[PDB]
Amino acid sequence: PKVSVLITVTGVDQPGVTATLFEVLSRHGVELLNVEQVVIRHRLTLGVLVCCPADVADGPALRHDVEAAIRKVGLDVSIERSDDVPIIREPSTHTIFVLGRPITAAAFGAVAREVAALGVNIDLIRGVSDYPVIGLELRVSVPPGADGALRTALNRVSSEEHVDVAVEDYTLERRAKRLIVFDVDSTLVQGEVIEMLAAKAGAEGQVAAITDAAMRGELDFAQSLQQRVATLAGLPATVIDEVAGQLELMPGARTTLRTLRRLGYACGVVSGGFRRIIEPLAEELMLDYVAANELEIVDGTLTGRVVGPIIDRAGKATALREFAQRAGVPMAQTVAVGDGANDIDMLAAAGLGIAFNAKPALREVADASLSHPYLDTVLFLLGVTRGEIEAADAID
Amino acid sequence: PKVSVLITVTGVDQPGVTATLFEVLSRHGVELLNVEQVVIRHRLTLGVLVCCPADVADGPALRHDVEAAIRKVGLDVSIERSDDVPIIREPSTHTIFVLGRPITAAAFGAVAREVAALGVNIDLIRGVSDYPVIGLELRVSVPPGADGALRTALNRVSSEEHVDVAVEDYTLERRAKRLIVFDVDSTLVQGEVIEMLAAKAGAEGQVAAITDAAMRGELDFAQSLQQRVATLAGLPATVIDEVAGQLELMPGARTTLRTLRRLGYACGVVSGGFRRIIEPLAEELMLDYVAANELEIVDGTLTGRVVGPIIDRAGKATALREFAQRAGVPMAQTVAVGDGANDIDMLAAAGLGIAFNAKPALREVADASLSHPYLDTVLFLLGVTRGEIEAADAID
Ligand SMILES: [Mg+2]
Ligand SMILES: [Mg+2]
Secondary structure: OOEEEEEEEEEEOOOOHHHHHHHHHHOOOOEEEEEEEEEEOOEEEEEEEEEEOHHHHOOHHHHHHHHHHHHHHOOEEEEEEOOOOOOOOOOOOEEEEEEEOOEEHHHHHHHHHHHHHOOOEEEEEEEEEOOOOEEEEEEEEOOOOOHHHHHHHHHHHHHHHOOEEEEEEOOOHHHOOOEEEEOOEOOOEOOOHHHHHHHOOOOHHHHHHHHHHHHOOOOOHHHHHHHHHHOOOOOEOHHHHHHHHHOOEOOOHHHHHHHHHHOOOEEEEEEEEEHHHHHHHHHHOOOOEEEEEOEEEEOOEEEEEEOOOOOOHHHHHHHHHHHHHHHOOOHHHEEEEEOOHHHHHHHHHOOEEEEEOOOHHHHOOOOEEEOOOOOOHHHHHOOOOHHHHHHHHHOO | OOEEEEEEEEEEOOOOHHHHHHHHHHOOOOEEEEEEEEEEOOEEEEEEEEEEOHHHHOOHHHHHHHHHHHHHHOOEEEEEEOOOOOOOOOOOOEEEEEEEOOEEHHHHHHHHHHHHHOOOEEEEEEEEEOOOOEEEEEEEEOOOOOHHHHHHHHHHHHHHHOOEEEEEEOOOHHHOOOEEEEOOEOOOEOOOHHHHHHHOOOOHHHHHHHHHHHHOOOOOHHHHHHHHHHOOOOOEOHHHHHHHHHOOEOOOHHHHHHHHHHOOOEEEEEEEEEHHHHHHHHHHOOOOEEEEEOEEEEOOEEEEEEOOOOOOHHHHHHHHHHHHHHHOOOHHHEEEEEOOHHHHHHHHHOOEEEEEOOOHHHHOOOOEEEOOOOOOHHHHHOOOOHHHHHHHHHOO
16 A cells, blocks of 8 residues: 555446455455445446555556456456546535425436536435325535525426525534424414314304415414404304314425434424414324414403414424424424414524415525425425335334 | 325436426315425435325326426336325334444444344434544434344454444434533543553553453552552642643543533543542533542651542442432433443443543443544434534534
């Protein structure tokens, strides 16, 4: 080891190639500086960087020994002086997730096009899921200052080509995500509980109308809440237990929460909804934190008011901050998932803010958006694969 | 998309290949099922699995369009019906770390040999460090029930070929490690504080002798502690502050702790040593938990006793369990790092037990061993790379 040599093996993968190459190398005076190997669709690449004595690199003995052993079995091999060559590759700066059902070639092509345009190198591509959505990951190296430009390009691509596209910082700190919060209505839970309550008063129509306006950001949250809850005035509080029982989880929600617990996540919900409905479900799903509003009840009857203070847009963010503090988790390591303008400050406050089948106003400011009715696609954005999830679930 | 096709591109890497391939594919009716791409030492492999109409896969139009575009620029491409082909690869079951200074080809060759013998498939190899030690990772798929056999083979290889070799479960749960404890003397800190104390009494020699015996497991811990501390009887308690100031961290310790905090680890020390020495240093290093013994002091003078109960071998384990409980971390997600037989139950109790420049008795039962005087090599065993550490440190 005075000078360095690079050995590169390619061809149709076969058993024992790796061991054969190094058993051959061991017969010379060779120390390893770096090894890289993968098989993709039965294509092997094995790159080995060694430093051997000056005496050895000058020698066709090493060359012949390697060339003969590799070519004999049917693969190809190259061998060259390195010296100027980098020993270990630098980490990727970002990772890009592409989800779709389907992901067209045109879509992915548009992603690649935008990436290359900004002088972004693609370091790796792999699949992260084949179900319930096709999911692909590109780890990339982005030129400094170009990432803002990159997110913009890819947002345009996402809207035009019908795929979800998320860009995330791939640094150590930023991917040690430890805490997550979900909005409840239309996020963790299907539908709007307040509409289910309003149905019992025969007011479902107007309340659905206002809820939709409020989640689009057209109405101030607090006022929209007071007005909608007013429509409940008179209902017996028994109605809370009924609606609570009719609640169905978002598809994939159980898988999501279960996988997140496996990963050691602190988990919570932040809702402008009602705690008597949310806390039963939260306890059962074994959550770590709840923040919700509260219905005023007099004589076992709903008054049509909520008990202040009212969790509003700023309030959600404040609750995440609070939760993160109780939990000892920096904001950069928090995740928030919501569907409404109700959620904008919570998503913004989060290290990673995820819009889930969301109104435009939320999508507009979210770190990432998800457009299929499967909450587990959240897991793909947290660096988890379908196979990993299924593997862990198989062991029970 | 009625049937599936596999497109595989190989050759010397060039800019815009990825985008070119998909721009070409977009002109046909093609949806993506899976994409995999890497460049190793300028060798590109791009494997793309698509489902195109039955009408299209029968067509030399797609074939010619792809073959022409790829071959024009100098790369090679194959195209074949798949159908029977798996869409996304399953996760690796284990990962193997190889550290050495140097790592000979013979060493690595022996690792590969043992791996292939047990019918273990190598899914990936990469470098994880080039400094202060050469570090390589092999993600592998191990046949069920063969892992015990694998750890044994590789332990033999490790001892015979002069490299550290660790086998770890590569499951979701088992690599979401969230809590770590260090032994202090000869682990986080250089040397044995008790010998530094004994030097002040002119007893360094005998105390060094007993400490060595005790860390090899030849002497019961509690008795070895009482006897050694007895030799301090009479020293003024001022001696505590002096020795404390002479304490030097193990090389790489600051990097280790700093990186672990970036990763959101709960961090602590469990020592049979003395809290008046350890707690000052622990506070400064901003640790989350300390367990230590305590020197008995009368009239500002050491009595030569310790204040019971005495943290012993079982005691260390008990402290880790306690810490894990305060922290809300399951034992499978805990890490312990020690050098002595003093540490055997703590290492055993830990999800990942790491022996650091350790006596044989500790190495014998450890999940993994490390033989170079660099504490940061712990980070490599936790799935961190040198480049990642340097990257995060560069941003300050
Ligand atoms: Mg909502
Ligand atoms: Mg020790």
